Amino acid sequence: SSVYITVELAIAVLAILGNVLVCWAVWLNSNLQNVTNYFVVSAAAADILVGVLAIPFAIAISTGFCAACHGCLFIACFVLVLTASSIFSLLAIAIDRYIAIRIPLRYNGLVTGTRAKGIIAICWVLSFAIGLTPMLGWNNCGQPKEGKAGCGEGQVACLFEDVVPMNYMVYFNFFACVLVPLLLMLGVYLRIFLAARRQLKQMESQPLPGERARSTLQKEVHAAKSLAIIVGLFALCWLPLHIINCFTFFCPDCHAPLWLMYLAIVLSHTNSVVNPFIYAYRIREFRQTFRKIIRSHVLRQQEPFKAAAA
Ligand SMILES: CCNC(=O)[C@H]1O[C@@H](n2cnc3c(N)nc(NCCc4ccc(CCC(=O)O)cc4)nc32)[C@H](O)[C@@H]1O
């Protein structure tokens, strides 16, 4: 459906705009320049690449244009590399927040700029490795479906499920790229929520009653509700599609309809617009820099059209 195409491109636009806004905001505002926001900006940079490249490629993965088998496989693998990078760098934000809340005394000496650049280098090496695995031999290109070839000789209708094996999708891709990060981000959230709960408990003993503690609680509560949003949206966005993959593979009896496939693919991509944008938006310092960039842009654009009194 062209309804799928337009929704897909609408999301691609929002993915670029929101995340460019996050990258501009960190580049302009001096106060936003800390190690946490290197992770935020890396997730944002990975989201831009999803919007600019991965989403267009994922549309071609549905249109079924005629291509060589491995060339079609190449396009599908690149979707996987670019989406994985967006997941792994989002996970880095979560891990950074965990170390901030659990070990606040040692955070600065521990999460240094050199180490942060190392963590995101690993994210890409991970995304390349998992995403390009089907290219090294784990593919369906041994038996190209030539019945559908009206394609030329040695060409196939370029479909994801045609070229990418479902045992790779379920055993490797779903496990490594969705479930494990989701389980870890959930783990991180539960611990951050726990710390905040225990903190409030010990303030109720009121030995001070507390003002150093008062802000600590506010930090932990803020971090708790931010990570609830990250994880909740991540699960809402990525689980439906991958469960369908487990549906298709683990249950060869029972297949999902076409409209449902598109909806799930679209949902998978919308994680790139909301994560980590909503996390960023939730910080007041991000929100006020957003307002300044937007308002400045609108005023610089509208001023030539604004007539003086005479
Ligand atoms: C790292 C995580 N990456 C991903 O999950 C990314 O890969 C892609 N994807 C992961 N599973 C899948 C998946 N089952 N089908 C697709 N498209 C194919 C759509 C489709 C296939 C077959 C048929 C029936 C054939 C016919 O009779 O006409 C119709 C539509 N893309 C995926 C997504 O773009 C995601 O963002």
Curated annotation (Swiss-Prot):
Transmembrane segments: 3-27, 38-61, 73-95, 116-138, 166-190, 227-250, 258-281
Residue intervals annotated with topology Cytoplasmic: 28-37, 96-115, 191-226
Residue pairs linked by disulfide bridges in the UniProt entry: 66-151, 69-141, 72-158, 251-254
Annotated membrane topology: Multi-pass membrane protein
Glycan-linked positions: 149
GO cellular component, one term: presynaptic membrane
Family in the record: Belongs to the G-protein coupled receptor 1 family.
Protein name listed in UniProt: Adenosine receptor A2a
Organism: Homo sapiens (Human)
Source species taxonomy: Eukaryota, Metazoa, Chordata, Craniata, Vertebrata
First-to-last residue of the parent protein present: 6 to 317 of 412
